[PDB]
Design a protein around this ligand. Structure first.
Ligand SMILES: Nc1nc2c(ncn2[C@@H]2O[C@H](COP(=O)(O)OP(=O)(O)O)[C@@H](O)[C@H]2O)c(=O)[nH]1
Ligand code: ALF
Ligand SMILES: [K+]
Ligand SMILES: [Mg+2]
Lengths: 94, 194, 208, 130, 133
């Protein structure tokens, strides 16, 4: 690593010096695994990870938090009470 | 002052957990053939550009610092700053299959059926009433073998009229304890067979 | 006795629903009980139900819901066994709380608030049956009551509470629907409060 | 002595409820069980959250919050109910004592033993185990 | 009705079975429901206590605490890095109205609640001058 003088002191310039051994491999023969063995080898334990539950999170302070969703409150489908004091027919002093 | 901004036709993908880079660009067979004399320089330059990109990513990774000193557990002291490597992405097969969970034994099935909760297992020490000491209840100098060294044992009335009358009660209790141990071993081997 | 019942239902509840009147929700808010709940029992979930929304204009209910949602989850409601509003939203919110606490084997939802806000009416609305006694007179409910809504959800009915204060005058307490009017001395002294709180046209239409 | 029979029913014929007459620690996030399934009753007035803990070194006593009930000497059942009686080992928050390990870690939880009868004197007194 | 007998139901689906277990109840259900009639003391013809009432046994236990070095060690410690992380986190939290607290984390909150104050409390004048002076 050498000082780059263009990317600052945080980004150096890289150079390589070969150590060996340099090798040229000719790919002669192949023997492949069966799909069931592939799946069995690439299975995961999953005991390590915390189970991810919907609407549940763990914040920066380590408190378990849950989220609730109110939904859409459509107040246009609410019929208010038809009180006598809101009716024009009972007008006075006309 | 050489540049540190490698420009590539196809963007290189990275596996920082494995410290690996993958570029899927075009390589000229005539420039990489063993007949040529610049082939090693070509390989060195390609590896140089890929390593420059990988090192840029690694030094752009978030860093972990600490204020603890040397002489404690952990390895990282205050002067050290460590890269936080992500989880590796390349799928690699395991050497051995996952540990299968052992099937429930006869005791476990019985305890589940009867609703017996497991023991607390606080410790092996018990208080001996006749003395004023806490003693192990089993094992090395355990309290399960005090009858073996008791100075005086009363011969039970039920042993009369039997051929075991003349036998030491300490030896009889040792035989019974060993039989219980062997019964436990046989039950374990039965659970393993099943 | 009433405050003993209140602390009993709070100690027994996982979710606490504070019921406000849509005509005067700030008047019907129990701020001291809210502060006690947020200080001592932070694991209990306090939400707002704005009841009697059928008695206010729609924009008034919407504005109150918006302003109270800056503090707590607030649901607009109209309590009625036959023709209600908000019942499905309240039920799905309770199911969400049960799903969050799915390891508790049951959760309890305690209804607290001022007298006559409609706690028993909301419980009857949720059960679709008159299971709690309801009356226009304050203090109809005296002891707590358990109601099984679903297999994992219990509702707790509580008597209404009026937190003590010095700024709350007798006129304010009377106009919050708290006291029984038959037991007051001189209601003509409170009628000017009705005149100040009501529109002239509305009064003249009501009484011709 | 530990439990008190609580009779239920109009004629008081059922006696399956029990009330713990001693002081208890219930811990964070306690919610009372539904009354129909509440067999063991720990009244809220007898619940405790803090104790007067005395450090044998430097001779001081501090009002510390309780973290857990480690061992009640009477029974593991009383341990899991959180009974606070004399001789009970409890876990206490010692953040204000300023204890630091030899490795530099700040100690904020230690063990103490209750030395009084809180049901008799209205308070929990304990001695830290140092 | 050979198919409706208790034996046949056990075939369709030894000493561990309890009384009352049928098509509607298993053993745990039976014992939980017998809780509601459990709390009674049993006495004989002459007044001997056959079995004491549940949670009413009168035998005095032998309450002892064994010596153990687990009693004198630390139970909870915290590193300086974790302390600084939680101290910085307390202040970055933007509380949402639709997030409820499911479980509070156990932390040394007395060490973590440190906010800079622009003013000092008043000096204790009784330290320098008493009432008698
Ligand atoms: N218009 C209207 N009246 C209601 C509503 N909810 C309750 N009430 C009325 O308010 C009065 C008191 O109801 P109640 O449930 O007993 O109040 P509680 O003291 O909180 O239990 C009853 O006469 C109900 O008819 C509502 O949503 N709209
Ligand atoms: F709170 Al009520 F009648 F139940 F006033
Ligand atoms: K009422
Ligand atoms: Mg009511």
């Amino acid at each position: 690593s050498y000082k780059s003088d263009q990317g600052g002191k945080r980004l150096p310039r890289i150079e390589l010096v070969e150590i060996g051994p340099r090798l040229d491999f000719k790919i002669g023969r192949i023997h492949t695994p069966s799909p069931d063995m592939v799946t069995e080898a690439h299975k995961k334990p999953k005991q390590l990870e915390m189970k991810t539950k919907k609407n549940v999170e763990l914040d920066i302070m380590g408190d378990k938090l849950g989220r609730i969703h109110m939904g859409k409150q459509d107040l246009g489908k609410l019929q208010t009470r038809k009180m006598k004091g809101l009716k024009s027919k009972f007008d006075q002093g006309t | 002052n050489l540049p540190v901004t490698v420009e590539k036709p196809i963007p290189v993908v990275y596996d920082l957990g494995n410290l690996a880079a993958f570029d899927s660009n075009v390589l000229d067979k005539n420039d990489l053939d063993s007949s040529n004399a610049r082939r090693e320089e070509k390989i060195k330059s390609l590896t140089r550009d890929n390593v420059q990109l990988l090192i840029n990513q690694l030094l752009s990774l978030p860093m972990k610092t600490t204020t603890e000193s040397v002489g404690g557990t952990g390895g990282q002291s205050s002067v050290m700053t460590l890269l936080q490597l992500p989880d590796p992405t390349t799928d690699l097969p395991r050497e051995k299959p996952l540990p299968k969970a052992k099937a429930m034994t006869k005791w476990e099935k019985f305890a589940a059926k009867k609703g017996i909760k497991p023991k607390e297992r606080a410790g092996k020490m018990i208080y001996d009433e006749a003395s004023g000491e806490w003693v192990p209840k089993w094992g090395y100098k355990g309290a399960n073998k005090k009858l073996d060294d008791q100075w005086l044992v009363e011969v039970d009335d039920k042993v009369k009229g039997t051929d075991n009358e003349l036998i030491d009660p300490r030896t009889l209790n040792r035989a019974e304890r060993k039989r219980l141990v062997k019964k436990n071993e046989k039950q374990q081997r039965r659970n393993m067979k099943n | 006795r009433i405050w003993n019942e209140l602390y009993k239902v709070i100690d027994s509840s996982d979710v606490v629903i504070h019921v406000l009147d849509a005509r005067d929700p700030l008047g019907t808010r129990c701020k001291s009980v809210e502060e006690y709940m947020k200080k001592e029992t932070p694991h209990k979930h306090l939400i707002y139900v704005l009841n009697k929304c059928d008695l206010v204009p729609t924009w008034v209910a919407a504005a109150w819901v918006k302003h109270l949602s800056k503090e707590r989850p607030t649901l607009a409601f109209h309590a009625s066994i036959t023709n209600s509003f908000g019942k499905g939203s309240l039920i799905q919110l309770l199911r969400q709380f049960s799903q969050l606490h799915t390891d508790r084997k049951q959760i309890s939802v305690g209804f607290i608030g001022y007298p006559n806000t409609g706690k028993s009416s909301i419980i009857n609305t949720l059960r679709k049956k008159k299971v709690c006694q309801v009356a226009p007179i304050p203090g109809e409910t005296k002891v707590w009551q358990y109601i099984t809504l679903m297999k994992r959800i219990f509702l707790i009915d509580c008597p209404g509470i009026v937190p003590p204060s010095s700024k709350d005058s007798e006129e304010d307490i009377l106009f919050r629907g708290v006291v029984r009017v038959e037991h007051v001395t001189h209601p003509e002294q409170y009628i000017p409060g009705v005149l100040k709180r009501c529109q002239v046209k509305h009064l003249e239409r009501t009484y011709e | 002595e530990m439990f008190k029979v609580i009779k239920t029913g109009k004629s008081r014929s059922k006696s399956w409820k029990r009330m713990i007459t001693k002081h208890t620690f219930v811990g964070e996030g306690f919610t009372r069980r539904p009354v129909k399934m509440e067999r063991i009753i720990r009244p809220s007035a007898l619940r405790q959250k803090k104790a007067n803990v005395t450090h044998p070194e430097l001779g001081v006593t501090v009002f510390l919050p309780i973290l857990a009930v480690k061992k009640n000497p009477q029974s593991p059942m009383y341990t899991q109910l959180g009974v606070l009686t004399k001789g009970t080992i409890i876990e206490v928050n010692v953040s204000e004592l300023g204890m630091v390990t030899a490795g530099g870690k700040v100690v904020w939880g230690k063990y103490a033993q209750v030395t009084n009868e809180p049901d008799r004197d209205g308070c929990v007194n304990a001695v830290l185990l140092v | 009705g050979t198919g409706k007998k208790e034996k046949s139901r056990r075939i369709r689906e030894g000493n561990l079975r309890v009384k009352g277990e049928n098509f509607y109840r298993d053993s745990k259900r039976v014992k939980f429901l017998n809780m509601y009639t459990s709390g009674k003391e049993i006495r004989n013809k002459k007044g001997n206590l056959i079995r004491a009432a549940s949670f009413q046994d009168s035998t005095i236990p032998d309450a002892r605490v064994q010596p153990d070095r687990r009693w004198f060690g630390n139970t909870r410690v915290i590193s300086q890095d974790a302390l600084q992380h939680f101290r910085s986190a307390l202040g970055e939290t933007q509380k949402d109205t639709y997030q409820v607290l499911l479980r509070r984390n156990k932390l040394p909150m007395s060490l973590l609640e440190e906010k800079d104050a622009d003013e000092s409390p008043k000096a204790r004048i009784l330290d320098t001058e008493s009432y008698a002076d």
